[PDB]
Design a protein around this ligand. Sequence first.
Ligand SMILES: [Mg+2]
Ligand SMILES: [Mg+2]
Ligand SMILES: [Zn+2]
Length: 600
Amino acid sequence: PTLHTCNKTSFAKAFLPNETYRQRLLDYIAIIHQLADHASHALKFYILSTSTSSFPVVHEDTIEAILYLLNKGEAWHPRKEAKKAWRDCLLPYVQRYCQIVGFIHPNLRGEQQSINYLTVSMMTNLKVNVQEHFMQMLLRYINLRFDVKGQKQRLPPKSDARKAFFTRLRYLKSVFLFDVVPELEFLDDLTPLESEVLEEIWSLDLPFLPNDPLAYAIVADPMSFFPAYCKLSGLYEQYGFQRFSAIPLRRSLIQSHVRIDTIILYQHILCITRRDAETVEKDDLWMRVCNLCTKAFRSRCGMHFEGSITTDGASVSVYLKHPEADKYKALYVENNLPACRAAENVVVIDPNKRDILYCQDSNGTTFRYTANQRAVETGSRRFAKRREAMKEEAGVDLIESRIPSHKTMNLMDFTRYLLVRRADWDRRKEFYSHPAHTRWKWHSFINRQKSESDLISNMRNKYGENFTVVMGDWSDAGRTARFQTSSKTKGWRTLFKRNRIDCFLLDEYKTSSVCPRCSSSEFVEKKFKTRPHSRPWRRREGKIEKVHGLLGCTNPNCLQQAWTSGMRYWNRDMLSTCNMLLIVRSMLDGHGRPEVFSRS
DNA sequence: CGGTACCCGGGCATA
DNA sequence: TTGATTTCATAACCTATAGATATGCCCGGGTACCG
RNA sequence: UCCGAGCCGGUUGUCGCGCGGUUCAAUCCCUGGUGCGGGUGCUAGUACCGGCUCCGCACUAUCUAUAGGUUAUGAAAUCAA
Ligand SMILES: [Mg+2]
Ligand SMILES: [Mg+2]
Ligand SMILES: [Zn+2]
């Protein structure tokens, strides 16, 4: 739904200073964490075990049955007919998995509430993974087998006659993907290399829709594509391609957040009979453990604190549930011109990798937010070196790095991964049991939250209390270019909304190749200065980096007789912002986007 | 000392 | 003698998806009652 | 495999400028922010109220898990003996 909000808080403030209640929380979280970790591995183990027959269909009952068997073994006595069949089917494999990993049944009481949350959560991961990444992996497999990486050199670009492969590839993809029915005569033109691809893709047993393409079939029923998706991963390992985790695994040993609701509260925390809870108000139960008077539990926007929290022993996530909720190009500046004209001040931002934000007003005031500032303010860089030092001090790297790949689909290979993981499981848990690992995640949230708040506060001082942000449309929806650090591009579109700041998108086409002072894209030079590589390890290699953020104009109008360089130097980020002001100003004035910056 | 019926709590179902 | 290219493990940052609890009924085991 | 930000110049609205100078500001523990007050604290300018620091209270902040890409660390394989 879309009627919930969360106010994260620390463990100390969330829970009252009661040692008995606090100890149960940590003990309960650890038990649930183990079940979630082993259940995911158990789910994959069952799938791999049956790989030599019809693929087993995975439903909510399948994951739920595994969780109960691990916790209760044979003591689980479901009455649903469907669950009974899965219990017997999964029982031989669950016991076998425990032998490999040495798991011992905790026999936790009142598992149902935790089981249901984990069951849905684990089931969600399968749906999400198949829905989005199924198309990406299948398309990648077609490209890899055709050596599209090497086709760049074999068929050099900038030639018309060499588009045959690209045209050939596009036609084959439609036929292979079954989106378009091929001509029956085309089968005689298949090359031996392409012939194998057609048969291999057919073996995936990809579903079909009589009137819709795969783009809609996957969304309609992602679970139907799960059996094909698992076999697709096997093909990647069969030819050395970069493997992907088709079956999600909760590998991390750090205590994960485990949801604690009203029922779990009396079941395990308060340890009182169900009658004691049924006869007492829901708010009263939580007040005995959690300090509801704190800021985190306060209501907001008509959303009250219905009992639900996820904690990991260092931080607590307090959720607010709206009463009306179930009990259980529109963002571009072009289409929002009427609102922009009413803005007190308009700010244009050109995101980049290093200069994550570079803002400029109509008056020319300059402000920027750099990734280095996040590295210091957020503390991620500090938490990086220190994390490595602890790993080296405890000698976990010597053990952690040798773990066999978990993405393998072969049963024998996966068995080795479990054995190696068990080989040094005891040592690693002691290392990850340190409070620092969970402390860093909570501290990162505070520093990251504090850094974002400071960013908005600084912008308000320079740009006023209320302002409208017109950011460039460029953004990385994942798949960030290699050799470049991660950066926040689409996230800023959400941060402004949380702070009651309107955000709009603008096209950046040709915005970096126009001199604002003469409005001409002809006399512009790019990447003329050179110097040793700024990266210390690349500099030792002797590499030379051509300047990227420096631009200049050779037009006589911009030059002066007293100069010796012969160019009016400009900054890439600042130059882009200046062009945006001209583009935005023209559109606001009714003249539209200038032809200089148009895709003509 | 030896059999029967009512109630409490844990478990499981499913919207 | 020496250094260049692929894959994998553990953290993180963004980025995209989905779900973001509760009431009713079974049963079995402990007890109270009767001879 | 290492870096904070603003400003005065070398600049002309110039560069991961490992160019100079200059001011703050984070180095651990902390959920952040807007405002309407009073007070068990410490700070600078000519008693007034510029700075952090607390409660008490209206509103304002979605997060967990998984996965793709990427970054840091640690490992495996090949080509010339
Ligand atoms: Mg841009
Ligand atoms: Mg830029
Ligand atoms: Zn010019």
